Amino acid sequence: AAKDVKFGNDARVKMLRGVNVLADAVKVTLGPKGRNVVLDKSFGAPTITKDGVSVAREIELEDKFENMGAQMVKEVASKANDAAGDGTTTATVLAQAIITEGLKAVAAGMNPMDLKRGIDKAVTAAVEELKALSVPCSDSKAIAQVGTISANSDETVGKLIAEAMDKVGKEGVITVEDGTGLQDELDVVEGMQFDRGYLSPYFINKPETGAVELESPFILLADKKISNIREMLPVLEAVAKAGKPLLIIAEDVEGEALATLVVNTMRGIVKVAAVKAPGFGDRRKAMLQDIATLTGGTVISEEIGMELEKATLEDLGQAKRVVINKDTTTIIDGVGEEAAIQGRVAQIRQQIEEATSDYDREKLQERVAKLAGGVAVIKVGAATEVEMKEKKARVEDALHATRAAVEEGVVAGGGVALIRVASKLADLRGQNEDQNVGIKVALRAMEAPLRQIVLNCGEEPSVVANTVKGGDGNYGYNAATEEYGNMIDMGILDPTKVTRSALQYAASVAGLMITTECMVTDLP
Amino acid sequence: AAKDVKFGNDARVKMLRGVNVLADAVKVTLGPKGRNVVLDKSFGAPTITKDGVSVAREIELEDKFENMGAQMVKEVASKANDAAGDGTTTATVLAQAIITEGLKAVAAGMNPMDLKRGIDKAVTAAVEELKALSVPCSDSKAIAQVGTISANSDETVGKLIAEAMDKVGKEGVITVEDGTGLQDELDVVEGMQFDRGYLSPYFINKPETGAVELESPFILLADKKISNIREMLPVLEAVAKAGKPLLIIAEDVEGEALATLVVNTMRGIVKVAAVKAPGFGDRRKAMLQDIATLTGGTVISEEIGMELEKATLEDLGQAKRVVINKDTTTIIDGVGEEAAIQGRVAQIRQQIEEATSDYDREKLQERVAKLAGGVAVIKVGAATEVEMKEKKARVEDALHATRAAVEEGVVAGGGVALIRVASKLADLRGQNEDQNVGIKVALRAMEAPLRQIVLNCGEEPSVVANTVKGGDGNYGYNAATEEYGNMIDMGILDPTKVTRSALQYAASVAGLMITTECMVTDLP
Amino acid sequence: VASKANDAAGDGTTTATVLAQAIITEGLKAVAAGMNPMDLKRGIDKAVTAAVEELKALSVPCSDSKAIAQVGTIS
Amino acid sequence: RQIVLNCGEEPSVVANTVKGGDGNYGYNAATEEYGNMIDMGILDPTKVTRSALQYAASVAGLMITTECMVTDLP
Ligand SMILES: [Mg+2]
């Protein structure tokens, strides 16, 4: 495939437009008073939306290059959200702001390497400043606080989160299910969560969480790499007959059998999903054994001479629900009995006595944790189906912002925090007067979100911005009600994680681009 | 798929043309004196029609964008109809009226956010005003009144509706069947109706109601999610042999089995339809059981160990007719015996005594209602087949307007009611002089329909408009007979629901548009 | 405007321009709101005849050498 | 508002604080500080301030009452 190669300036100009199109389409939706974007949709009527993440997802441009620009900003703004629960649009908005001004600088004939340095300093410094502005959220009161605000003034959401954290801890694995009455319920139950994701996006059966949700599935617990679907066919037949879905948790599932199970749930013959096993090497086999104990399954270890050709249902583990992500598997209510589950904790307990190293310790206590610690399920109740799966949705929104608030606190939500931190470090210097521009570019980039919210509202940016800067702490402008005040008191807050992650992630891709010299791609 | 992105002004201009084309094709048919639109039809001779809903249906433009414009207005105007039984065209005609004027404003350099505010106030205000102009329709007299008017001066249609409501209540489920004599008949019969719709539009066998009509069908009452067509094949074989259609009322029917039954009624091998079960969670299983009792079917609950592989005809329920919509299922004359049906009411009756909550109460009485309350069937009689299925059509038209009148009353039909409410709130102000323009645009929009009817008739708008405005209450101009009078007395009325829905829905989409900043779509 | 400004006082031509660009912008915007432009004018004028009196009232004589130097300098 | 824009600060912030004062309070663009403009010796000759308003208005006025425009083919 012959390529089209672009250099230095051409490269960066293509890049820039690319990014502007992403940013102009996505940024107009930022406020509590964003504008609509109309997103055509093949058959039927277009979609009108104010949700940046929807707008983003659709942007792809004709000009490769331009496209590569826009795809790069998308990539990283999506990670911001990956790590924080939010900011995807903010990250994009800031990303433009740096790229634009930095990219002008390079083109004016200043030094890219220094502009990056400056920006990077300005970020480092403001991330600190954010830590300082940050108001902790630690007690049950504060937990319910950020939950209720994050779930839109609904006090009962705040409560339920507060209560869950209260039962399984601020770590504790907490999930949400569809509710069966009008009543909310909170139950702790045997289960577990581990940091492995689906092996193919095509397993997803609920694309709005971009996640897989299996009901009452059998669980295969194979300790080996699954390559051929041949090994599978006795188990997949017993499963298809019990009319239930199946989770594979093996070392891995590769090429053949993978692309097989994929096209097997594509046409919906047997719904299946597979994820790598937790951990690696020596502590893998122990950790797989744990999930066995949890779901009353049998581990199929090739190191004792058992093939998957010799496995009937009786071997498969079993749980009342399982939910997988991009990068998380969480098993809810495992049928494996307490006679066993406790007995295993008593085994692992003792392994901690015969620990002679510290790394061998935490690794055994993270295991005792996952296992005896449990998973807290919230059932969201409501009057009507619509209400319910809307409330359910907000419950997951808040749970997200709260887990976030716990870790790093909250700060002025309006754009405010970034406006603030930037007026604080407005002495900042570097050594090149090139790094100075770097720092300024970055600083003035940080106004972008506030200026944008205001703009969208149809008020004057410069004016609101200047008066937010005049103040201190979390004094800000609440675009929704047009009143200045203490943004936090007024219930307009972002987790610290999320404003930071936005900024860092914007800065990264902006540096990347200000230091790009070449761009390779396919021929038009 | 690379997109084509258009901003602010461009976007809006494209939208505007898009919406005009829809409106100018559609609006010439509005009056009792509309003009014809010719709608080409592939093989054979074209279609001449005066029916805005037909013209709309055909509108799709080449320029995406422009097309998006038209598609959005169609979307929303069709929901008006969805919620009221009429106004599809009016909603479009008002939609254009705001969009045109508000969109000129934005372009002139006034503030979108305020213009929307203004319009929305003017609407809010006139919706109230409408409630005031509204004359209730409550007693048997009034019911037959709006029925007869709505069925075109035919007093017998008014009667039959009046009589049905009179037997099963202004709520009670009332349907219409083809008549078998020259005589109309009214019968109440064991049956029921619940708020769930077809799972695929391809089930529709009578596209002019956009609805599915099955005759003497067996009913599968499965309590589970149906994924595989494997589970089905014994029951679909017994059903195909009895040469009768089949209704599935299971928790759901998914991907595989769904797209299967779909292509199974496409080539017409077995006519089938499936709809989700009523309600969710705990009260679902009870509610499914009720339909069982009603049709003497057996509920197949996986929670007792019964597969669909073990179900012969003897399990399927049975009713003399069933009709499904976009969003309604209604089961007419269930064979399930009165020994059982009454017994079930006596059971549920008692559950109300052992109610300790209010939500647990209404939920049990909505169940006693649906079941012992029954379904009232009108059979439309006539002399010839043509007459009959034309009369049958007007009977459903009136039934619609009546159900609607009941809920919110009737008002001056001629466009009048809007013309009136508008001349009432002609002081209205906002705060921006921008919002003022908003309110005016909106108000002056409200004349559109009257002006258009008059215009279609080939009389002078300005002049009839001015004289309708000079009057009060429901004095208006009856375009069909060119006489001013009391629109309601003269038999030219619109259910309150329908004039309001039309307005609100046109205002929504206009706001939406006046506040759209970006427009994404595929490349030409 | 710019030309006349200049035959009249040989200064302020940019301001003048700036003002007209401004009356016009705003005025046309109100013609699109559907005001009667002949009235827009009458108002603009009335506004102005008023503003001129106002100016003649703020004016204070410039008659020392210092002030004269300041107008020079600023010009 | 243009004086201020030409310095690359924000016209509506400057105009607002100027508007918030009295008599000859105004913004010294050169020194970027507020104060009394007479004392700072930032004097415009009245006859100019006045002619700029008069002439600008005189034509702008007519201009916004254009409804048709006649001219040559390109
Ligand atoms: Mg000068």
Resolution (A): 3.0
CATH code at position A154: 3.30.260.10
Q: Which residues of D touch C (CB under 8 A)?
A: 2, 38, 41-65, 67
Residue A143 Cα distances to A119, A155, A377, A392, A444, angstroms: 34, 11, 17, 18, 33
How many Å is the Cα radius of gyration of chain A?
A: 26
Q: Are residues B244 and B342 in the same domain?
A: yes
Among B409, B437, B472, residue at a domain's last position: B409
Distance CA A256, CA A448 (A): 48
Number of neighbouring beta carbons within 10 Å of residue B397: 17
**Which letter does DSSP use for residue A357 in this model?**
S
Closest CA to D48 of C41, C44, C24, C19: C19
- Residues spanned by the domain of A442: 1-134+410-524
Residues of chain C neighbouring D51 (CB-CB closer than 8 A): 4-5, 8-9, 12, 16
Q: Are residues B403 and B418 in the same domain?
A: no
Distance CA A154, CA B267 (A): 51
Give the H or E element holding residue B447: none
User: Hey, what amino acid is at B199?
Assistant: L
What is the domain count for chain B? 3
> Are B48 and B36 contacting, i.e. CB atoms less than 8 angstroms apart?
yes
Residue A338 Cα distances to A335, C18, D36, angstroms: 9, 84, 84
Residue whose entry in the numeric block shows the structure tokens 């083809």: B178
Phi, psi of A48 (to 5 degrees): -100, 125
Closest CA to A447 of A108, A103, A100, A105: A100
Distance CA D34, CA A198 (A): 63
The answer to whether the Cβ–Cβ distance between C33 and B105 falls below 8 Å is yes
Q: Are residues A149 and A259 in the same domain?
A: no
> Are B466 and B124 contacting, i.e. CB atoms less than 8 angstroms apart?
no
Show Cβ contacts of residue B458 under 8 Å, excluding neighbours closer than 6 positions.
Answer: B33
CATH code at position A500: 1.10.560.10
Closest CA to C14 of A91, D52, B112, B237: D52
Distance CA A403, CA A409 (A): 10
Residue whose entry in the numeric block shows the structure tokens 């539009």: B201
Q: Quick one: CA dihedral A255, A259, A264, A265, positive or negative?
A: positive
Ligand 1 centre and the CA of D51: distance in Å? 13
Distance CA A51, CA B435 (A): 26
Judged by DSSP in three states, A145 sits in: helix
Side-chain half-sphere exposure of B500, counting CA atoms within 13 A: 23
Structure tokens at B459: 């009389």
What ranges in B352-384 are assigned the alpha helix state H?
Answer: 359-373
Annotated binding site of D for ATP: 28-30, 44
Side-chain half-sphere exposure of B518, counting CA atoms within 13 A: 29
Distance CA B460, CA A28 (A): 44
> Are B99 and B514 contacting, i.e. CB atoms less than 8 angstroms apart?
yes
> Are A259 and A244 contacting, i.e. CB atoms less than 8 angstroms apart?
no
Number of neighbouring beta carbons within 10 Å of residue D74: 3
Burial B78-113 (b: 16+ CB within 10 A, else e): bebbeebbbbbbbbbbbbbbbbbbbbbbbeeebbbb
Number of neighbouring beta carbons within 10 Å of residue B64: 22
Q: Are residues A257 and A393 in the same domain?
A: no
Give the H or E element holding residue B339: helix B338-351
Structure tokens at A211: 């996640």
User: Hey, what amino acid is at B413?
Assistant: G
Phi, psi of B352 (to 5 degrees): -65, -30
Q: Are residues A345 and A203 in the same domain?
A: yes
Ligand 1 centre and the CA of C41: distance in Å? 28
Enumerate the β-bridge partners of residue A315. Answer: none
Q: Are residues A247 and A265 in the same domain?
A: yes
Among B341, B371, B401, residue at a domain's last position: B371
Judged by DSSP in three states, B217 sits in: coil
Ligand 1 centre and the CA of B65: distance in Å? 49
Q: Are residues B382 and B431 in the same domain?
A: no
Distance CA B516, CA B406 (A): 37
Closest CA to D41 of B81, C69, A209, A127: C69
Distance CA A36, CA A70 (A): 20
Q: Are residues B66 and B111 in the same domain?
A: yes
Residues of chain D neighbouring C73 (CB-CB closer than 8 A): 41
Q: Are residues B35 and B50 in the same domain?
A: yes
Q: Indicate which of D1, D4, D16, D27 best probes the interface with A, i.e. most A CBs within 10 Å of its own CB.
A: D16
Distance CA A116, CA A511 (A): 5
User: Hey, what amino acid is at B327?
Assistant: D
Chains that touch C (3 or more CB pairs under 8 A): B, D
Residue whose entry in the numeric block shows the structure tokens 């199929």: A300
Distance of CA A334 to the CA centre of its chain: 26
Identity of the residue in C25, C28, C32 whose CB atom sits nearest the CB atom of B104: C32
How many Å is the Cα radius of gyration of chain B?
A: 26
Distance CA C5, CA C13 (A): 5
C and A interact (at least 3 Cβ pairs within 8 A): no
> Are B353 and B346 contacting, i.e. CB atoms less than 8 angstroms apart?
no
Q: Are residues B513 and B423 in the same domain?
A: yes
Residue A516 annotated as binding site: no
DSSP string across A294-310: HHT---EEGGGT--TTS
Q: Indicate which of C19, C26, C28 best probes the interface with D, i.e. most D CBs within 10 Å of its own CB.
A: C19
Distance CA A112, CA A446 (A): 20
What is the edge-to-edge ordering of all strands in the sheet holding A375-380?
A: A173-178, A375-380, A185-189
Show Cβ contacts of residue A304 under 8 Å, excluding neighbours closer than 6 positions.
Answer: none
Chains that touch D (3 or more CB pairs under 8 A): A, C
Ligand 1 centre and the CA of C12: distance in Å? 5
What ranges in B232-384 are assigned the alpha helix state H?
Answer: 233-241, 255-266, 282-295, 338-351, 359-373
> Are A255 and A196 contacting, i.e. CB atoms less than 8 angstroms apart?
no
Max Cα distance, chain B (Å):
75
Ligand 1 centre and the CA of C68: distance in Å? 15
The answer to whether the Cβ–Cβ distance between A55 and B518 falls below 8 Å is yes
Residue A30 annotated as binding site: yes
Strand B375-380 with B173-178, pairing: parallel
Distance CA A200, CA A367 (A): 27
Q: Are residues B113 and B196 in the same domain?
A: no
CATH code at position B327: 3.50.7.10
Residue B51 Cα distances to A109, B393, B458, B491, angstroms: 66, 15, 18, 21
User: Hey, what amino acid is at A27?
Assistant: K
Structure tokens at A515: 């230091």
> Are A500 and A81 contacting, i.e. CB atoms less than 8 angstroms apart?
no
In angstroms, what separates the C-alpha of A46 from chain B's closest C-alpha? 6
Q: Is A311 exposed, middle or buried, given 0-12, 13-18 or 19+ CB atoms closer than 10 A?
A: buried
Among A409, A430, A461, residue at a domain's last position: A409
Q: Are residues B199 and B181 in the same domain?
A: no
Number of neighbouring beta carbons within 10 Å of residue A38: 27
> Are A48 and B512 contacting, i.e. CB atoms less than 8 angstroms apart?
yes
Phi/psi-derived region of residue A189, left when phi > 0, alpha when psi is between -120 and 50, beta in every other case? beta
Q: How far apart are the first and last CA of chain A?
A: 11
Distance CA A467, CA A475 (A): 9
> Are B345 and B333 contacting, i.e. CB atoms less than 8 angstroms apart?
no
Show Cβ contacts of residue A96 under 8 Å, excluding neighbours closer than 6 positions.
Answer: A19, A20, A22, A23, A27, A73, A448
Show Cβ contacts of residue A301 under 8 Å, excluding neighbours closer than 6 positions.
Answer: A223, A224, A285
Show Cβ contacts of residue A116 under 8 Å, excluding neighbours closer than 6 positions.
Answer: A102, A438, A511, A514, A515
Torsion on CA atoms A120, A122, A125, A131, rounded to nearest 10: -100
Judged by DSSP in three states, B356 sits in: coil
Angle between the B8-26 and B88-108 helix axes, to the nearest 10 degrees? 150
Residue B433 Cα distances to B114, B115, B355, angstroms: 9, 9, 57
Distance CA A56, CA A354 (A): 53
Residue B524 Cα distances to A62, A524, B104, B163, angstroms: 12, 16, 27, 57
